[PDB]
Design a protein around this ligand. Structure first.
Ligand SMILES: [Mg+2]
Ligand SMILES: [Mg+2]
Lengths: 113, 96, 56, 346
DNA sequence: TATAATGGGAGCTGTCACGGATGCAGG
DNA sequence: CCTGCATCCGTGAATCGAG
């Protein structure tokens, strides 16, 4: 390159590759849903929380106020469907969606780099 | 090294290259006749200068070193057959 | 009664160290931990893979 | 955690003896030794055997082993037979058993008490090839020797007589265990004398001395040749794991070839020589070649005299020597014509 | 074989990021 | 008394050359 500023080289992407091959949990981790449900939101200045409510049970997800959201309020998401923008915990995905979704996620995410 | 009239190092990466190719007898050559096998390399050189084909490679000396170094750590390492009966790669020289 | 099992995902390093062939496991990494747990269990290497046969 | 500091803590528990206490212990020890002597005069048993029995009961059952110096094997059965044999003695006699026991106990307490002395002495001998703890333990051996060889009647403080044996044991240890190639103590004293000599000369001459200069200052019997020989002997081996380069990827022993095991060229040449020699011995008859094969030791690997070969083939020894002359001469004519074995002359 | 002597001595300090075991206070 | 988080120690850290 000559030392000019540009897009992310292999130096940036390689840690992601190793992060996926080693099945490690991301430092900045994306939060997914263990079960299916509908979205209900709660927002405050010093507190932000997103409720995933099903017909049989209800799960609360307390998030930092600065967190990004991939889901619209009142949507219908699958088990282990991305909510927070970021890398998915392969083991959270494993206990939720199963082996096939993990294999597909690993292969695709590694390929991306 | 050139100074010591030494051979070229066939690293584990070069081993991978042969493995990936699937060249088993070329790899077995490097691991035995062309390096670490004593009886095999003497019979090899003898075969080539006699015009005869190279002999079947014997068990490497460096593995025997591994075995005895592991025995020095008080760990028993035994080579076996399918009958789970001990096989002596030292050919009676290590047994009383 | 059948055994109830759960799929388990482990990194390439821990997977390569948890392989059934102790010759390959020891010749990879953490030789001490591998050799001890193998010597205790009286493990045998069936020489299934490439590494074990390369060593041999 | 730290072996040295831990041993120093184990030493600080035992208090230092008063003059009275020290004399008392040494007294009981000496009287204990006399008691073992007297018990040997009565019982009719070995003083060493008795001493080890008394030593066993004092130390307890925690230590039971066979003593090299003793003739019988030392086991709890034996020491109980002897202890009961000793306690089968009358009042004025059985008294000595109590004296011997008290003596050994005083001996244990005396050696235990003066371990601080060994530490403060062995601390000066460090860096001579033996570790600190190795020196201390060797000084402990000398301390044991000092205790058993001490006589309290001389009114000498025990530290005075102990120090000599302690230094003696330490110096003996350094002289014995240091060098990888073990060298006799007298020869080490010679080499070290050569060191102080060469250092004295280098200090006065403002340069490193010649072999002849040291030979002069050494006195009679010393020439330059003998000095050089002595120095050659004192040469210590170097580690094969010696680092080559500023990286850790290279070792010293990696550059050293093996001179013992035959190269493929050697083995091939040897096989070619045996084959060509058999090709040469087939230009003879089987009998006149067998005479040579038995003579030089190709077969069986033994060289025979003319009498044995004559005792085998059934002819006279002069016939055998005649056959061997004819065979060698035929092989000479075969060699002169074929020009095959010539290259193997090396 | 004998004045008396009695608890050592030098540390290496500018990597790092992982797994797993120990231990701590907290519900 | 048992879960969870902080923290400790031990283990890794490309290849071939020469040196
Ligand atoms: Mg002289
Ligand atoms: Mg960590």
């Amino acid at each position: 390159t000559g030392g000019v500023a540009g897009a992310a080289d292999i130096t940036q992407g390689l840690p992601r590759v190793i992060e996926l091959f080693e099945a490690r949990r991301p430092k900045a981790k994306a939060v997914i849903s263990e079960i299916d449900g509908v979205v209900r939101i709660e927002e405050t200045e010093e507190k932000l929380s997103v409720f995933v409510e099903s017909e049989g049970f209800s799960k609360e997800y307390k998030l930092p106020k600065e967190a990004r959201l991939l889901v619209k309020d009142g949507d219908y998401v699958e088990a282990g469907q991305p909510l927070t923008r970021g890398a998915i915990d392969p083991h959270q995905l494993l206990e939720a969606k199963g082996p096939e979704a993990v294999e597909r996620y690993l292969v695709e995410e590694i390929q991306k780099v | 090294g050139k100074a010591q009239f030494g051979g070229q190092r066939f690293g584990e990466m070069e081993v991978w290259a042969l493995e990936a190719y699937g060249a088993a007898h070329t790899l077995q050559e490097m691991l035995t006749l062309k390096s670490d096998d004593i009886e095999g390399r003497n019979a090899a050189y003898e075969a080539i200068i006699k015009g005869e084909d190279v002999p079947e490679p014997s068990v490497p000396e460096s593995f025997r070193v591994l075995v005895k170094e592991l025995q020095a750590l008080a760990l028993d390492v035994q080579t076996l057959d399918e009958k789970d009966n001990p096989v002596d790669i030292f050919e009676g020289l290590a047994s009383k | 009664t059948p055994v109830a099992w759960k799929p388990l995902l482990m990194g390439v390093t821990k997977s390569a160290l948890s392989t059934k062939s102790w010759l390959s496991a020891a010749s990879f990494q953490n030789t001490t931990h591998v050799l001890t747990e193998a010597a205790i269990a009286g493990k045998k290497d069936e020489l299934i893979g490439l590494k074990e046969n390369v060593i041999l | 955690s730290d072996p040295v500091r831990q041993y120093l803590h184990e030493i600080g528990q035992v208090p230092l003896l008063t003059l009275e206490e020290e004399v008392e212990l040494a007294r009981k020890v000496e009287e204990g030794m006399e008691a073992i002597k007297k018990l040997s005069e009565i019982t009719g048993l070995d003083p060493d055997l008795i001493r080890e029995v008394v030593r066993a009961k004092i130390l307890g059952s925690a230590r039971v082993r066979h003593i090299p110096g003793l003739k019988e094997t030392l086991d709890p059965k034996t020491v109980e037979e002897i202890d009961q044999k000793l306690k089968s003695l009358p009042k004025e006699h059985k008294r000595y058993l109590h004296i011997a026991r008290e003596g050994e106990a005083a001996r244990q307490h005396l050696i235990e008490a003066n371990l601080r002395l060994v530490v403060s002495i062995a601390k000066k001998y460090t860096g001579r090839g033996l570790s600190f703890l190795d020196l201390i333990q060797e000084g402990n051996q000398g301390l044991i020797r000092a205790v058993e060889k001490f006589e309290y009647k001389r009114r000498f403080k025990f530290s005075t007589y102990a120090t000599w044996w302690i230094r003696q044991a330490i110096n003996r240890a350094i002289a014995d265990q240091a060098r990888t190639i073990r060298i006799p103590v007298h020869m080490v004293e010679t080499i070290n004398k050569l060191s102080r000599t060469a250092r004295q000369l280098q200090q006065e001459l403002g340069r490193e001395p010649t072999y002849e200069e040291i030979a002069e200052a050494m006195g009679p019997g010393w020439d330059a040749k003998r000095v050089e020989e002595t120095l050659k002997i004192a040469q210590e081996p170097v580690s094969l794991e010696t680092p080559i380069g500023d990286e850790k990827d290279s070792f010293y022993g990696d550059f050293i070839p093996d001179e013992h095991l035959p190269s493929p060229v050697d083995a091939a040449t040897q096989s070619l020589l045996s084959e060509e020699l058999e090709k040469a011995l087939s230009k003879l008859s089987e009998r006149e070649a067998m005479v040579l094969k038995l003579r030089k030791g190709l077969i069986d690997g033994r060289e025979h005299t003319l009498e044995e070969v004559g005792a085998f083939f059934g002819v006279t020894r002069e016939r055998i020597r005649q056959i061997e002359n004819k065979a060698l001469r035929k092989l000479k004519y075969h060699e002169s014509r074929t020009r095959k074995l010539r290259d193997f002359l090396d």
